Design an enzyme around this catalytic site. Sequence first.
Site, PDB file in Angstrom:
ATOM      1  N   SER A  61       0.777  -1.243   0.000  1.00  0.00           N
ATOM      2  CA  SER A  61       0.000   0.000   0.000  1.00  0.00           C
ATOM      3  C   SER A  61       0.808   1.292   0.000  1.00  0.00           C
ATOM      4  O   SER A  61       0.250   2.359  -0.253  1.00  0.00           O
ATOM      5  CB  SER A  61      -0.916   0.033   1.217  1.00  0.00           C
ATOM      6  N   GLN A 117     -10.785  -4.757  -1.970  1.00  0.00           N
ATOM      7  CA  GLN A 117     -10.123  -5.431  -3.073  1.00  0.00           C
ATOM      8  C   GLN A 117     -11.009  -5.418  -4.308  1.00  0.00           C
ATOM      9  O   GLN A 117     -12.228  -5.554  -4.210  1.00  0.00           O
ATOM     10  CB  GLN A 117      -9.789  -6.889  -2.724  1.00  0.00           C
ATOM     11  N   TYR A 147     -11.166   2.728   3.098  1.00  0.00           N
ATOM     12  CA  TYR A 147      -9.911   2.375   2.430  1.00  0.00           C
ATOM     13  C   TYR A 147     -10.108   1.279   1.383  1.00  0.00           C
ATOM     14  O   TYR A 147     -10.633   0.213   1.692  1.00  0.00           O
ATOM     15  CB  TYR A 147      -8.894   1.927   3.473  1.00  0.00           C
ATOM     16  N   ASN A 149      -8.497  -0.503  -2.459  1.00  0.00           N
ATOM     17  CA  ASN A 149      -7.695  -0.643  -3.666  1.00  0.00           C
ATOM     18  C   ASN A 149      -8.521  -0.379  -4.918  1.00  0.00           C
ATOM     19  O   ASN A 149      -7.990   0.096  -5.924  1.00  0.00           O
ATOM     20  CB  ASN A 149      -7.061  -2.036  -3.746  1.00  0.00           C
ATOM     21  N   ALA A 315       1.301  -3.318   2.936  1.00  0.00           N
ATOM     22  CA  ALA A 315       1.355  -4.755   3.098  1.00  0.00           C
ATOM     23  C   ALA A 315       1.089  -5.478   1.796  1.00  0.00           C
ATOM     24  O   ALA A 315       0.250  -5.067   1.003  1.00  0.00           O
ATOM     25  CB  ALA A 315       0.355  -5.202   4.151  1.00  0.00           C
ATOM     26  N   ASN A 340       4.718  -9.656   6.625  1.00  0.00           N
ATOM     27  CA  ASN A 340       3.600  -8.785   6.962  1.00  0.00           C
ATOM     28  C   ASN A 340       3.220  -8.936   8.440  1.00  0.00           C
ATOM     29  O   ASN A 340       2.431  -9.803   8.799  1.00  0.00           O
ATOM     30  CB  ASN A 340       2.397  -9.088   6.069  1.00  0.00           C
TER      31      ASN A 340
HETATM   32  C1  LIG Z   1      -3.444  -6.955  -2.211  1.00  0.00           C
HETATM   33  C2  LIG Z   1      -2.352  -6.505  -1.294  1.00  0.00           C
HETATM   34  N1  LIG Z   1      -2.626  -6.547   0.127  1.00  0.00           N
HETATM   35  C3  LIG Z   1      -2.352  -7.703   0.769  1.00  0.00           C
HETATM   36  O1  LIG Z   1      -1.892  -8.667   0.166  1.00  0.00           O
HETATM   37  C4  LIG Z   1      -2.583  -7.825   2.121  1.00  0.00           C
HETATM   38  C5  LIG Z   1      -3.101  -6.754   2.820  1.00  0.00           C
HETATM   39  O2  LIG Z   1      -3.332  -6.879   4.175  1.00  0.00           O
HETATM   40  N2  LIG Z   1      -3.369  -5.601   2.165  1.00  0.00           N
HETATM   41  C6  LIG Z   1      -3.910  -4.507   2.940  1.00  0.00           C
HETATM   42  C7  LIG Z   1      -5.394  -4.381   3.028  1.00  0.00           C
HETATM   43  C8  LIG Z   1      -3.140  -5.482   0.821  1.00  0.00           C
HETATM   44  S1  LIG Z   1      -3.493  -4.027   0.064  1.00  0.00           S
END
Ligand SMILES: CCN1C(=O)CC(=O)N(CC)C1=S
EC number: 3.5.2.6
Length: 358
Positions: A61, A117, A147, A149, A315, A340
């Site tokens: 992130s 996600q 929050y 992605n 992470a 992580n």
């Molecule tokens: C997709 C990437 N990712 C992870 O693999 C694990 C995680 O805890 N986070 C944070 C929400 C992300 S963005």
Amino acid sequence: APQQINDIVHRTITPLIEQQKIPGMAVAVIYQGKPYYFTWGYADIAKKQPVTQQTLFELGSVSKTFTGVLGGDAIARGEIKLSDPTTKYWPELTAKQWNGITLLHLATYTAGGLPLQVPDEVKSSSDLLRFYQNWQPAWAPGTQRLYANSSIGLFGALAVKPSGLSFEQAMQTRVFQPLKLNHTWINVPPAEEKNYAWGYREGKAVHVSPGALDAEAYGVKSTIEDMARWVQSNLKPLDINEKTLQQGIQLAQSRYWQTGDMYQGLGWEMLDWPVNPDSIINGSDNKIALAARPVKAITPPTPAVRASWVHKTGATGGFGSYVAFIPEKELGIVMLANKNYPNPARVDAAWQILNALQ
Ligand SMILES: CCN1C(=O)CC(=O)N(CC)C1=S
Ligand SMILES: CCN1C(=O)CC(=O)N(CC)C1=S
């Protein structure tokens, strides 16, 4: 390095590595604008390869800060406006719930409940369109920060559309290269593979999987030296020669929204310095950091505040990273690890280190 810096870092990081069972770690402390480096453990356990200043870590992130700055650069170039509707840059997005949802909303997770996600089921570009078309908001635009992605990821994609460049090309030529981030990558080339640390999840060696909008949301890999330089750039944006990039960095630290004592920038998150350590430490815990929370609009946004704790946690499955800095103090830190481990542990260590040095 000053023995103060050495002792403070070592006394803090060594127990952290032990307690969290972190295989490998690199730390950069920016003190009075100058970086100081520290490395521990292994980038590759099986090969007994140590962590070095050239070791590539997955930023997760923390990538969003590059995305935020790239977006800011696009604004400064006059290629986009954050006030524009999303549909202006994606006309195919005709579903009615997209009315009133601006690029600002995407960039700051305030569109109204876009998911954390992008669904793994989304593979093609038409899948991606179908996904956003069928998404139903839980909230009105600009009322709740969640929050996601899928939010800033779409922002990144749209932000570079007018330029005609792919996201990776825009980032390379407009951000990485002018800042001389020569070991920072969206895709790690074979020539650099030897330095690419493995992540470790449940004892297994892992690298981040390909996913929709990965580059935009969590796809950057970098070394502790480039990340130190990234921090220097964001500490002192005025020392930067490229006008639009300089302005872009300023815009990324503008305060667009407030929730609790935290302010949402573009990628970056900021709080007033001095901070209540409990607040940033507890706030970084996912039960808060990933929670839906109401926002107060900052109208107009406050320009980048020098007396701020500016930071971002990151992470992937096998990596945990953290970046924090205080522009007013020429003081910052980068923590890169190939495990992580819990966010509050990262922030606790960072505040412990920076507070002792301020
Ligand atoms: C997709 C990437 N990712 C992870 O693999 C694990 C995680 O805890 N986070 C944070 C929400 C992300 S963005
Ligand atoms: C768009 C106006 N604006 C801000 O809101 C904040 C800021 O820092 N700057 C300077 C780059 C500008 S122009």
